[PDB]
Design an enzyme around this catalytic site. Structure first.
Site, PDB file in Angstrom:
ATOM      1  N   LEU A 195      50.957  38.013  29.994  1.00  0.00           N
ATOM      2  CA  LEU A 195      51.897  37.094  30.075  1.00  0.00           C
ATOM      3  C   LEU A 195      53.118  38.133  29.655  1.00  0.00           C
ATOM      4  O   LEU A 195      54.133  37.828  30.393  1.00  0.00           O
ATOM      5  CB  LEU A 195      51.589  36.294  28.973  1.00  0.00           C
ATOM      6  CG  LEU A 195      50.421  35.036  29.155  1.00  0.00           C
ATOM      7  CD1 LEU A 195      50.416  34.269  27.963  1.00  0.00           C
ATOM      8  CD2 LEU A 195      50.353  34.458  30.394  1.00  0.00           C
ATOM      9  N   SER A 219      54.706  41.898  27.461  1.00  0.00           N
ATOM     10  CA  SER A 219      54.635  43.136  26.652  1.00  0.00           C
ATOM     11  C   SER A 219      56.033  43.441  26.287  1.00  0.00           C
ATOM     12  O   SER A 219      57.020  43.302  26.819  1.00  0.00           O
ATOM     13  CB  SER A 219      53.847  44.235  27.289  1.00  0.00           C
ATOM     14  OG  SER A 219      54.765  45.010  27.730  1.00  0.00           O
ATOM     15  N   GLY A 220      55.887  44.317  25.159  1.00  0.00           N
ATOM     16  CA  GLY A 220      57.498  44.636  24.645  1.00  0.00           C
ATOM     17  C   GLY A 220      57.382  45.222  23.074  1.00  0.00           C
ATOM     18  O   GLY A 220      56.418  45.650  22.751  1.00  0.00           O
ATOM     19  N   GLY A 221      58.307  44.748  22.206  1.00  0.00           N
ATOM     20  CA  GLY A 221      58.173  45.525  20.852  1.00  0.00           C
ATOM     21  C   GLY A 221      57.182  44.746  20.109  1.00  0.00           C
ATOM     22  O   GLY A 221      57.120  45.374  18.933  1.00  0.00           O
ATOM     23  N   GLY A 243      53.998  43.836  21.265  1.00  0.00           N
ATOM     24  CA  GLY A 243      52.908  44.264  21.715  1.00  0.00           C
ATOM     25  C   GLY A 243      52.530  43.820  23.003  1.00  0.00           C
ATOM     26  O   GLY A 243      53.373  43.613  23.884  1.00  0.00           O
ATOM     27  N   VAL A 252      50.552  40.736  25.276  1.00  0.00           N
ATOM     28  CA  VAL A 252      50.004  39.190  25.134  1.00  0.00           C
ATOM     29  C   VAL A 252      49.595  38.757  26.543  1.00  0.00           C
ATOM     30  O   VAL A 252      50.163  38.703  27.442  1.00  0.00           O
ATOM     31  CB  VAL A 252      51.312  38.165  24.723  1.00  0.00           C
ATOM     32  CG1 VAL A 252      50.686  36.753  24.715  1.00  0.00           C
ATOM     33  CG2 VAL A 252      51.857  38.496  23.685  1.00  0.00           C
ATOM     34  N   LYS A 305      47.051  38.189  21.743  1.00  0.00           N
ATOM     35  CA  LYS A 305      48.143  39.068  21.477  1.00  0.00           C
ATOM     36  C   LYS A 305      47.332  40.415  21.031  1.00  0.00           C
ATOM     37  O   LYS A 305      46.765  40.208  19.516  1.00  0.00           O
ATOM     38  CB  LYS A 305      49.080  38.458  20.372  1.00  0.00           C
ATOM     39  CG  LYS A 305      50.061  39.533  19.991  1.00  0.00           C
ATOM     40  CD  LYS A 305      51.313  38.729  19.461  1.00  0.00           C
ATOM     41  CE  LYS A 305      52.336  39.720  19.225  1.00  0.00           C
ATOM     42  NZ  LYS A 305      53.772  39.116  18.136  1.00  0.00           N
ATOM     43  N   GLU A 359      47.489  29.570  20.048  1.00  0.00           N
ATOM     44  CA  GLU A 359      47.603  28.386  21.027  1.00  0.00           C
ATOM     45  C   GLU A 359      48.387  28.863  22.236  1.00  0.00           C
ATOM     46  O   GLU A 359      49.326  29.779  22.060  1.00  0.00           O
ATOM     47  CB  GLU A 359      48.702  27.341  20.189  1.00  0.00           C
ATOM     48  CG  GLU A 359      48.943  26.133  20.869  1.00  0.00           C
ATOM     49  CD  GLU A 359      49.627  25.058  19.834  1.00  0.00           C
ATOM     50  OE1 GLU A 359      49.886  25.595  18.794  1.00  0.00           O
ATOM     51  OE2 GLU A 359      50.086  24.161  20.601  1.00  0.00           O
ATOM     52  N   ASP A 372      63.902  36.305  13.976  1.00  0.00           N
ATOM     53  CA  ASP A 372      64.174  36.868  15.309  1.00  0.00           C
ATOM     54  C   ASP A 372      64.273  35.374  16.136  1.00  0.00           C
ATOM     55  O   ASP A 372      63.839  35.466  17.292  1.00  0.00           O
ATOM     56  CB  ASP A 372      63.061  37.612  15.716  1.00  0.00           C
ATOM     57  CG  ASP A 372      63.576  38.310  16.991  1.00  0.00           C
ATOM     58  OD1 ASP A 372      64.896  38.559  17.377  1.00  0.00           O
ATOM     59  OD2 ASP A 372      62.598  38.978  17.664  1.00  0.00           O
TER      60      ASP A 372
HETATM   61  O1  LIG Z   1      51.356  30.928  24.713  1.00  0.00           O
HETATM   62  C1  LIG Z   1      52.013  31.901  24.665  1.00  0.00           C
HETATM   63  C2  LIG Z   1      51.847  32.659  23.327  1.00  0.00           C
HETATM   64  O2  LIG Z   1      51.276  31.933  22.248  1.00  0.00           O
HETATM   65  C3  LIG Z   1      52.951  33.552  23.220  1.00  0.00           C
HETATM   66  C4  LIG Z   1      53.045  34.372  21.769  1.00  0.00           C
HETATM   67  C5  LIG Z   1      52.453  33.806  20.465  1.00  0.00           C
HETATM   68  C6  LIG Z   1      52.668  34.438  19.079  1.00  0.00           C
HETATM   69  C7  LIG Z   1      53.310  35.710  19.250  1.00  0.00           C
HETATM   70  O3  LIG Z   1      53.488  36.424  17.963  1.00  0.00           O
HETATM   71  C8  LIG Z   1      54.103  36.339  20.492  1.00  0.00           C
HETATM   72  O4  LIG Z   1      54.444  37.614  20.451  1.00  0.00           O
HETATM   73  C9  LIG Z   1      53.523  35.749  21.693  1.00  0.00           C
HETATM   74  O5  LIG Z   1      53.421  34.063  24.158  1.00  0.00           O
HETATM   75  C10 LIG Z   1      53.683  33.415  25.458  1.00  0.00           C
HETATM   76  C11 LIG Z   1      54.298  33.927  26.591  1.00  0.00           C
HETATM   77  C12 LIG Z   1      54.388  33.527  27.870  1.00  0.00           C
HETATM   78  O6  LIG Z   1      55.183  34.051  28.998  1.00  0.00           O
HETATM   79  C13 LIG Z   1      53.722  32.380  27.908  1.00  0.00           C
HETATM   80  C14 LIG Z   1      52.877  31.833  27.176  1.00  0.00           C
HETATM   81  O7  LIG Z   1      52.105  30.706  27.248  1.00  0.00           O
HETATM   82  C15 LIG Z   1      52.724  32.650  25.752  1.00  0.00           C
END
Ligand SMILES: O=c1c(O)c(-c2ccc(O)c(O)c2)oc2cc(O)cc(O)c12
EC number: 2.7.11.1
Length: 265
Positions: free
Chosen positions: A9, A11-13, A15, A17, A32, A82, A128
């Site tokens: 989905l 990435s960045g600072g 981690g 996902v 993540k 979630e 943030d």
């Molecule tokens: O469902 C998603 C999700 O839970 C997170 C997420 C949750 C907690 C974190 O701490 C974090 O860094 C990212 O990212 C996403 C990025 C997308 O483009 C689309 C998504 O559906 C999610």
């Protein structure tokens, strides 16, 4: 083995996902990954503060992303979260659609306020708040806060550390490397609201932040302008409380999330 991994989905600072599925019940999840050496803050067994904070807010229903499980690996922690579907983050949403109608921005901003109040009420400071850290459930019209990786336990004393997003950080941080949680949050909410109604953030450079002068590039009502300028007051003590924000004339008659989706999504 308990989760089926899908595409990356983002990435960045924060981690990396991944999209995923809980094999048990086909529940859509987000997976993540956080490398341990790239972690600055730890809490309690010792884990990333992110895990500590998520657990404090993951109780009950809210506009906060829920932590479902987590695991420890030799060199990383894995977070099962979630995942809304269909979904789009607020940054991409504003990028595609440009500045949002005030009715839509009112609904979104209100939901963010409710989520931030929930965190604070649970002893958690996000640190943030921004468009990239807000997910939109496009069918339900519900917003979710994500990425607590820069957050901290909420306290009433001064913060001297910050690893959030600079262009959302308050002038007292830029200038003194000192801020208080709530007043700094309100500032970032001011930046966010401007971003919603103008399609871009108001300040780019440190000196623009310090000067705190707000220019509107789009047609925005006087009441919305006033609330923004209030949130972006240079003196922290001159900023509104969350209560004062939600009792502001521009924040009246908010649409329900479902109405919001039916009309705007
Ligand atoms: O469902 C998603 C999700 O839970 C997170 C997420 C949750 C907690 C974190 O701490 C974090 O860094 C990212 O990212 C996403 C990025 C997308 O483009 C689309 C998504 O559906 C999610």
């Amino acid at each position: 083995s308990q989760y089926q991994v899908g595409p990356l989905l983002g990435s960045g600072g924060f981690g990396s996902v991944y999209s995923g599925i809980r094999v048990s019940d086909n529940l859509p999840v987000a997976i993540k990954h956080v490398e341990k050496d790239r972690i600055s803050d730890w809490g309690e067994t010792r884990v990333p503060m992110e895990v500590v904070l998520l657990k404090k807010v993951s109780s009950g229903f809210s506009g906060v992303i829920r932590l479902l499980d987590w695991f420890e690996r030799p060199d990383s922690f894995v977070l099962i979260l979630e995942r809304p579907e269909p979904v789009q983050d607020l940054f991409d949403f504003i990028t595609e659609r440009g500045a949002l109608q005030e009715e839509l921005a009112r609904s979104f901003f209100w939901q963010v306020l409710e989520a931030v109040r929930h965190c604070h009420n649970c002893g958690v400071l996000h640190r943030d708040i921004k468009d990239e850290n807000i997910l939109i459930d496009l069918n339900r019209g519900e917003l979710k806060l994500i990425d607590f990786g820069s957050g901290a336990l909420l306290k009433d004393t001064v913060y001297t550390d910050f690893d959030g997003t600079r262009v959302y950080s308050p002038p007292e941080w830029i200038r003194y490397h000192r801020y208080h949680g709530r007043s700094a949050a309100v500032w970032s909410l001011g930046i966010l609201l401007y971003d919603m109604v103008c399609g871009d953030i108001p300040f780019e450079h440190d000196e623009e932040i310090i000067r705190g002068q707000v220019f509107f590039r789009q047609r925005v009502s006087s009441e919305c302008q006033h609330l923004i300028r209030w949130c972006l007051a240079l003196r922290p003590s001159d900023r509104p409380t969350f209560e004062e924000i939600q009792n502001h004339p521009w924040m009246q008659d908010v649409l329900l999330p479902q109405e919001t989706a039916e009309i705007h999504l």
